[PDB]
Amino acid sequence: TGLSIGIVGATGQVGQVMRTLLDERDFPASAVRFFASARKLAFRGQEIEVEDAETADPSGLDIALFSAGSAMSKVQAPRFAAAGVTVIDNSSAWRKDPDVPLVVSEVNFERDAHRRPKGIIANPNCTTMAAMPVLKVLHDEARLVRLVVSSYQAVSGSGLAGVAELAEQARAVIGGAEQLVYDGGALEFPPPNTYVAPIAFNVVPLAGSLVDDGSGETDEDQKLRFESRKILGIPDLLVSGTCVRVPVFTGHSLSINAEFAQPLSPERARELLDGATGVQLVDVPTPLAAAGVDESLVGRIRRDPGVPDGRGLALFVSGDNLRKGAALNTIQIAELLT
Template identity: 40%
Template sequence: MGYRVAVVGATGNVGREMLNILAERQFPTDEVVALASRRSLGTEVSYGDTTLKCKDLDTFDFTGWDMALFAVGSEATKKYAPGAAKAGCVVIDNSSLYRYDPDIPLIVPEVNPEAVHGYAKKNIIANPNCSTAQMVVALKPLHDRATIKRVVVSTYQSVSGAGKEGIDELWDQTKSIYNPTDDKPPQKFTKQIAFNVIPHIDVFMEDGSTKEEWKMVAETKKIVDPKIKVTATCVRVPVFVGHSEAVNIEFEEHLDEDEARDILREAPGIMVIDKREDGGYVSPVECVGDFATFISRIRQDSTIDNGLNLWCVSDNLRKGAALNAVQIAELLGREVLKKG
């Protein structure tokens, strides 16, 4: 016996990826429905070897459905998710709306699976920010061994994190560089993204950080340990898919780089590719379409006591969004609902 699953926002990049991953991982379903706004009514999306026609989210009745994977913005989530949850359908939400609600669990299954039982308070589970998700997968097993005091992270985030408009803008601007008569000024981003990097993701906050940077701080504390100090600089780079992060970690105890490498090799969801030679590391292009979070460049930081550096790369549309949501659904089914 399988689950009845709704994918909300099925025409977007993340929604389509959710459908792909549900099929790839053979998630036990009796029925899957693709939901989108009225303007996308009837649009066809792929689910494994079958094609689904999108239904109207505005008029959909969630009664009798087990789970809804939401891949729409916070405004649409605020409008539709409470009704779905009230109808008895567990909402797994990819937006930022519920991440900081103390009554709603924020989950990365490899890190804090026990938190899934907290879903019952509001019938909603939050999916973390893409940049946080991949980082905490790497932090947790190291934290369990040597207790992390502080994390300094610089991100190199792909344009797909800004949706289809971000991908289109990089593509169009790149072409326009070679065609001076076809100028493509910034629209989605604040500056030219082609052949450039932009140290600005989301809105600025009073302390000078951006909200993306604040998210990494708040979410790491909620998912891993509130005692961990985190400082982040988040940068948009001209890469289509795949987020990269340079992570500096300070521990309470000494942790040798070789032991850290061994710990990460055994940790769930991680693939260590770390050879000290040309090409002996993973770049974002190589991680696209993969389920794993890749770790490379593991080395001691000699400037502080008990410090390590590492390089972390993952497909942001997968682990950073769609894959993590499906893994939450799997966890929910295995630990709580137990139908599949």
């Protein structure tokens, strides 16, 4: 193709996964550029200059994959787009923009991706992303009308800081761990910094900032609503989500109660999902099995008897939050663009 691609925020975890994935698809080193801010990184038999995202000239680039935070994206994505670059942004900066498609590669690319008057395609929230290839298939069959979601979120979603917080707490208390059986305050945890409570040997039902709307929901709770709506193209979708942090390094999981407009049996759900792109049907999905692979793992599909006439399911999903949940999806979009 002779396609030219850039990565903005190349040294972060997501940036690293983007690089690994570009490599694992045998993409020429000669057609790749890296950017960060405030000097060389190896990529397939070559050392690549880490340019300055703010001041470097983006022209020549066909596609830029951003994973550099929202503040940077608000400024730099239009600058890159102005220079003729198609920007795929892994941040929240453009997700709520009605002129920016919010795209899961095998879900709404054809429907939404071609309409990008700002030159920007937004990459969805990782937690939402993991459920999308699963729900799309069920929605196409039976029409999805309501979601209840409880998540089990890995710390790598918080960048390196989440990883370090988990590792350092676990290392500090592992020696006396069994005392936590009788007294959760028995041990000396290094004080939390990123999270509102210790994460090692704990669960923490609080992810994100509390939205200033009187709801009691965090921005992460609400992403499950807003982004599912936009991605699935169901503007009035009913959603109640609870984001909960767990002591897992990589791999987000979701306990999903999904209601449809017509009956949908577990057997039929299994039959549809077994075929599906970006999906693997398993008995017991786990984040450890999901970490390092590409598909969303789905299983534990049951009828929810709280929905009349077999229109409700309970199902469980695990997916890698750095791969499909971030890096992989941007690259899959880039492939579909070219």
